[model samples]
Target: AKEWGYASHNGPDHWHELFPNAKGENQSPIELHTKDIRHDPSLQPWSVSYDGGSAKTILNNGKTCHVVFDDTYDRSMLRGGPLPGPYRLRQFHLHWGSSDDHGSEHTVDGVKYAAELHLVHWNPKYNTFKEALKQRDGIAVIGIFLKIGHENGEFQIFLDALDKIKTKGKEAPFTKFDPSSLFPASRDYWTYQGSFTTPPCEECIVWLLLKEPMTVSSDQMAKLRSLLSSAENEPPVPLVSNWRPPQPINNRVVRASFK
Candidate 1:
């Protein structure tokens, strides 16, 4: 099988040919319209107990810049809200574009942000992350938008590590970073059942997209764009626009945590 990438040939459009789930009904990154979102009063605020030292390393896997965490025994956890049980934080990554005007995979009221951060967690009931992926309530993803604005000190560490992982397969030690530091003060969010935006597009994710966005300076965005999808010695393929467009909403109801 051919490798799937953000190239013109193997991009999102061609993904269905290789991965049937890419065309599944519950596909993710759906556009969220404030007017259409249902305000569910029954919805509760979710909380995260993140251990700063759980983060192990940051790497560029040709897809996006990812930071892996120690989920061995639920060192960091997400509980309450729509989740059936506590989920262990596994990793986090970002999706961005070539320019600041647009990059986020999930758009709000047709507006695009500079980028989107996904904090992925897996249900511990499944025993393993691989096993968790097979169930409908297997994983939970927190989506935070990164808007272009004032300088964000919380994200500076990631930009600094980007210098070392300039190309694919490059990795560096990354720890002592608190994931909650990047979260907005507001607990407002839109929750929905969706699939993974990337391939094999499993319909096992419960997406919780925060209403507020974090600030990022233009210089920081430039640093994110500096990454290369190509490995060392390969023709340079700038790692930009690594975001999947909004998929169909179908018959899904997007529930809001706030009225």
Candidate 2:
């Protein structure tokens, strides 16, 4: 399922046709300004307390580790308040445009941001990621848009880890790391029910998009562009473009509490 196929290239239009229910009323099509953002004090403060879990890399699955960070995908998880049962961290990855001008899945007022980061988490109430996909409250994804600009000190942590696993299908030990340190100082955000930006495109995620974007140096951005699409035996291919095109506005109304 991880391998790229015909379904991977057809984009969002094809996705909606495949799963009509996957399209939701809250699909975001613009950058959410800080002034119009909101948050629920009652919602558990999202946190990532991983201590760098064991790592492994296999051919055909894609780049890097089976478990690069000590995430909730392991199933040993914590409970969520009033939101069914426990929600476990599943996987973390990124989406970037072919070029720097546009790549983020969600737009803000007709403006497309540079990139989007997705930290996918799943609810344990339904038993598994597959079963959870059928429910409205099955998942939560923390989204942080990235903009090309001056170097961000906070992003240095992830950048430092990149060099350790420069080759595709390779894994290494990383320790004493706290993923939460990367979050923006402002906890303010915009919330909505939306589908996964990628295919299967399930509409079960609770989206928390940060109002502010983190900066990445031009040099750092170039390094990410240099990543291989597959293992060494596979042809040398650069992972410069791994983003999906934007979907229709679909008359969805995005809600912000601070507005």
Candidate 3:
């Protein structure tokens, strides 16, 4: 088992030590520079239809937050745009900062958002997420950047679960929520071929990062930092700043759905 995290000794700078692919050519969460992204008119419009009742639970693994879902083929899915077919929605997690200055894994010309939401999806063609992990066109993650401006009522549902899962390995039921409601008004986005921003760091993801950022309030962000990476018996460590820094772009080319 390859154990990794954000501490100095096990941080991203050390992941490549055990997981060679951590420094692979197609690694993700790269600097998405506007000057380099190509505009492709042929790219289809992004579409997402999620079942509000599909969410299973929200968990804090001490490192970051994750909201799992019932990903049965007919339940929740995302398609169109850069995906070949409708992919099953496995879960959606988030990355944020201690303060609002910077926290997102992906950046645009060095501009980092207050937070980033990753809707992890796997191709239905694959039997399971583990199987998809090894295939090149296996997974597609929809990335939505979040900023602090207003206390959004729509986001309150997820926020409510944070308090319950404050400790690492903690979890709480979090269903009956429609993820589509979290989407921004503008669907314009940038697409790229990248890898998972974690251990194993498989080069198997199509990243669709929305150009329009959503809004949340400073209070809401504070609740996120309250999450503790430490378990019930361990010395509590704040779960703030779980995001990995931008990786090298290498030879990968990014595409924009709009000009």
Candidate 4:
């Protein structure tokens, strides 16, 4: 069996060769620098809401879970839509570095943030996630990059909830907390259609990458680095470095309403 997928050891160098459009002329270590950094206000707005869907383990195989909140169809408050559809909150996860300095998906110019949070949603427009996977607009992901600096009081909400899942293969009733609070007051973002950075390399997402990253203290990041990829009985696999290499820009312009 393959120990890892293309996104792993192969990295971006290999990814561009496979999907040329994914990463255009820009080579690895691209830089994102601007003297006058401003947030765009015209980006699509989203608000967070709760769900009562069944929770399940997220394994390496990626077959154990079901579709909950995707962009092609199912409507959920988590995506800033009104409730009542089959859309549900499947899971909440993150990608971080072993250390405090790096782990985000998109690098502004060439700067890597401390971490990135992905709230994956599925579209009910196609009945099932399996079918939705075949469509370009099947998935909608809300991406939040984390910078290391001053502590963000808002992040405490997620850290408090982190205790609920102390081990892998474990999940429970998550309620009361509003996900919208996680949103920065700024709505500026970069929008694009891209594939999941992970395996099977499905291209079925409408990505909304927030321009403004939230801040977390170094100690808080240390706590995040402690998460395990596998359960206690299994050989301890650190969850740090779960990030997929950045995909090819594909000659496609990443649109920013703010820009």
Best by lDDT: 1
- The sequence of per-residue lDDT tens digits that candidate 2 reaches over residues 31-150 is 444444444555554444443342222122243222333333553343443345556766567666667788787777666767777766787667877898887779877778888999
Candidate 4 residue 32 Cα shift, in angstroms, is: 6.3
Per-residue lDDT tens digits for candidate 1, residues 1-259, read 6469988899999999899999889998999888988799888889999999999999999899999999999699999889988899999999999999999999999899999999999998999999989988899999999999999898886678888888889999998988798888887999999999999999999999999999999999998998999998899988877899889999999999987
Compare the candidates by TM-score and give the number of the best one.
1
Candidate 4 lDDT by residue in tens digits, 15-67: 54456434434322222344434444445455555432333233222111111
CA lDDT for candidate 3: 0.88
CA RMSD of each candidate after superposition: 0.9, 4.4, 1.0, 5.8
Ranking by lDDT: 1, 3, 2, 4
TM-score of each: 0.98, 0.74, 0.97, 0.71
Which segments of candidate 4 are over 4 A away from where they belong?
1-75, 78-89
Segments in model 1 whose C-alpha atoms lie over 4 Å from true places:
none
Sequence-dependent TM-score of model 2? 0.74
lDDT of each: 0.91, 0.60, 0.88, 0.58
TM-score of 4: 0.71
